[PDB]
Amino acid sequence: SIIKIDLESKTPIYKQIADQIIELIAKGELKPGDKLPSIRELASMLGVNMLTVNKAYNYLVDEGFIVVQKRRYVVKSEVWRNMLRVIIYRALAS
């Protein structure tokens, strides 16, 4: 009920998981250092296969919002503009 899986959105499930984990980090409901649920504990929480959560947790690792602390997932601690620049550009070019 914290992470809403939107089954008819066209955002892939793993990406809605990741997006919402970022929102929760943004909202501060997940402070830094906060260990995350297991891949298995979160999949079952959501009704989802571990693979989709795996993909979600890895997306968050490459993007730099969580980190692995000997095989457990933890919110990191530090430091999207190019994203803005491309949509203004896409905006004004209309």
Next chain:
Amino acid sequence: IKIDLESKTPIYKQIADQIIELIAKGELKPGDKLPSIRELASMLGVNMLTVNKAYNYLVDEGFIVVQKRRYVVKSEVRDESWRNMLRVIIYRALASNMSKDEIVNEINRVVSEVNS
């Protein structure tokens, strides 16, 4: 586009960020098209598995879109996909210890900037 083989950043992420740079820096732009998965996988010395992933990373982020069998810089605005990307921008901003006063102060600074 150059692949730093020794960096800890993943290859697909390297490719993606560099292309995003081109889209952002105007050097790549709405309606433009990108090399085939294989053309790029052959320009670079990289197998097509991680090139495919790079492209599908740009698709999910919202940057490009398959049009015929072609990966194409997104041109379409006013839709809901437009609005999602914004939310991601402010959401990722807030999640990097930025004020809300801060972020939108800096949003205006980039809109004005490129109306060049």
